[model samples]
Target: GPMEQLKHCNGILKELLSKKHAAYAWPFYKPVDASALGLHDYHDIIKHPMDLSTVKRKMENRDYRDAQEFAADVRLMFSNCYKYNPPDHDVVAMARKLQDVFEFRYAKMPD
Candidate 1:
């Protein structure tokens, strides 16, 4: 069930970002590339309070298969977690850590 879901969503996402990286992500990835990701948008991604609402939104909504776009959405999410309350405010540095983990793990992932 989720496999099929990933098939379609991943297709759309690849086109949206790229088979390698999301232009939107790179822009925002830089903490407001101001080209496409924008500072305003980055501010909207990470926060602890968001954990509850975001988690609930995914679990309850029932289409959680879509949440796996870590290259795009996952980073988008963790980045918010980092910002939600402030890096020192409790959100933790999980965003950058996750980013490092994946970037390293998938350094050679095929496209």
Candidate 2:
């Protein structure tokens, strides 16, 4: 069930990123913390119980498009931070950490 849910959420995220809409981009895309959304750290977005529930509900409702938009907004926020200070070591490191976490989680997820 978790894997299924995760896959569904991932689909939503991909869709959202493609849209590039601002409304769906604000919550997770805080300009102040670009590295915060790094691969590993992105899990924090899914880790929150409330966030999980929201995502689950959205998927169940087949609102994948909107859900993807929401994820994209979050990524955008983090991306903005990365873009603003592209050469910052701390920022890059943080983003890498986040990316690591995301990768680890993804690897462990069941098919």
User: Candidate 1's error at 20, in angstroms?
Assistant: 26
Query: What are the per-residue Cα lDDT tens digits for candidate 1 across 13-101?
Result: 34333435442233223332324634455434533222223433444455455435434554555555555446663225434544564
RMSD of 2: 12.7
> Which residue ranges in model 1 land beyond 4 Å of their true spot?
1-70
CA lDDT of each prediction against the hidden true structure: 0.43, 0.45
The TM-scores, one per candidate, come to: 0.34, 0.35
Q: Which number leads on lDDT?
A: 2
Highest TM-score: which candidate? Answer: 2
| Model 1 RMSD vs true structure | 12.5
TM-score of 2: 0.35
Cα distance off (Å), candidate 2, residue 79: 3.4
